[PDB]
């Protein structure tokens, strides 16, 4: 565990993280994909051996000794708001189980279903609150990675609100 488990946010490519493991915003088929998934494929392509896994689940594959946790959020283009919400919460609960099982002291995590799987909606608050529900009972240092300056400010504010 971390000495004083924390949440932080950074605005940069998750493929350059400084944590003991990474969460991929995966697709169910283990394909290179786009966005975070493509950056993860470039950096850790070995981790895509038998990484296919259903929506709402996480599957870890080692790249050397570095764990890549493939977390499959719902594509809100395909799911109803209600079913999508249930699967998005479930994907994060499976991430918390994997982070715990691995015994890591830190994890780099993107906001699932906020990019090409958002169904064109802003899901910062929805995705971040499911991340907190899952990760609050873990003792790993969590570092959330984002792209956009306005998202960094909103994520930082949500973290600081609780402290
Ligand atoms: O390929 C995919 C699927 C989900 N999320 C991404 O970032 N890329
Ligand atoms: O538009 C987006 C989606 C995810 N993360 C960001 O920082 N911006
Ligand atoms: Cl960067
Ligand atoms: Cl996404």
Report whether 154 contacts 123 (CB < 8 A).
Answer: no
In terms of Cβ atoms closer than 10 Å to its own Cβ (0-12, 13-18, 19+), residue 162 is: exposed
Cβ of residue 148 lying under 6 Å from some atom of ligand 2: yes
Distance 34 CA to ligand 1 centre (A): 5
Report CA dihedral (145, 151, 32, 49) to the nearest 10 degrees.
30
Place of tokens 């697709």: 27
Cβ of residue 146 lying under 6 Å from some atom of ligand 2: yes
Find out whether 117 is annotated in a ligand binding site.
yes
DSSP, collapsed to helix, strand or coil, labels residue 12 as: coil
The reported resolution of this PDB entry, expressed in Å, is: 1.4
Ligand 1 atom closest to the Cα of residue 36 is 7
Residue nearest (by alpha carbon) to ligand 2 atom 1: 115
> What ligand has the least distance to the C-alpha of 146?
2
How far is CA 87 from its chain centroid?
14
Report whether 144 contacts 14 (CB < 8 A).
Answer: no
Nearest CA to 47 among 22, 74, 81? Answer: 22
Nearest CA to 36 among 52, 13, 10? Answer: 13
Distance 67 CA to ligand 2 centre (A): 23
What is the DSSP code (8-state) at residue 4?
Answer: S
Determine the length of the chain.
Answer: 163
Backbone angles phi, psi at 38, to 5 degrees: -70, -40
How far apart are the C-alpha atoms of 23 and 60, rounded to whole Å? 9
DSSP per-residue letters across 90-123: HHHHHHHHHHHHHT-SEEEEE-TTSSTTSTTS--
DSSP per-residue letters across 32-72: --STHHHHHHHH-GGGGTT----TT-EEEEEETTEEEEEE-
> What ligand has the least distance to the C-alpha of 122?
2
Q: Is 87 left (phi over 0), alpha (psi -120 to 50) or beta?
A: alpha
> What ligand has the least distance to the C-alpha of 14?
3
Q: What residue segments make up the domains of the chain, in order of their start?
A: 1-163
How far apart are the C-alpha atoms of 123 and 2, rounded to whole Å? 29
Mutate to test the pocket of ligand 1, among 31, 37, 41, 112 (most ligand atoms within 8 A of CB): 37
Cα torsion 123, 126, 132, 133: sign? negative
How far apart are the C-alpha atoms of 84 and 73, rounded to whole Å? 8
Nearest CA to 23 among 99, 128, 137? Answer: 99
Backbone angles phi, psi at 35, to 5 degrees: 65, -135
Cβ of residue 111 lying under 6 Å from some atom of ligand 2: yes
Report the run of H or E that residue 143 belongs to, with start and end. strand 141-146
């Amino acid at each position: 565990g971390a000495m004083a488990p924390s949440y932080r946010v950074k605005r940069m490519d998750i493929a350059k993280n400084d944590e003991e493991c990474v969460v991929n915003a995966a697709n169910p088929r283990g394909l290179p994909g786009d966005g975070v998934c493509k950056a993860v494929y470039k950096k850790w392509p070995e981790s895509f051996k038998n990484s296919a896994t259903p929506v709402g689940t996480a599957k870890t594959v080692m790249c050397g000794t570095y764990p890549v946790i493939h977390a499959v959020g719902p594509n809100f283009s395909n799911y109803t708001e209600s079913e999508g919400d249930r699967e998005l919460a479930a994907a994060y609960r499976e991430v918390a189980k994997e982070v715990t099982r691995l015994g890591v002291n830190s994890v780099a995590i993107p906001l699932l279903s906020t990019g090409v799987y958002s169904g064109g909606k802003d899901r910062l608050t929805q995705s971040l609150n499911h991340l907190f529900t899952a990760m609050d009972s873990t003792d790993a240092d969590v570092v959330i990675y984002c792209r956009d300056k306005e998202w960094e400010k909103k994520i930082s504010e949500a973290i600081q609100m609780r402290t």
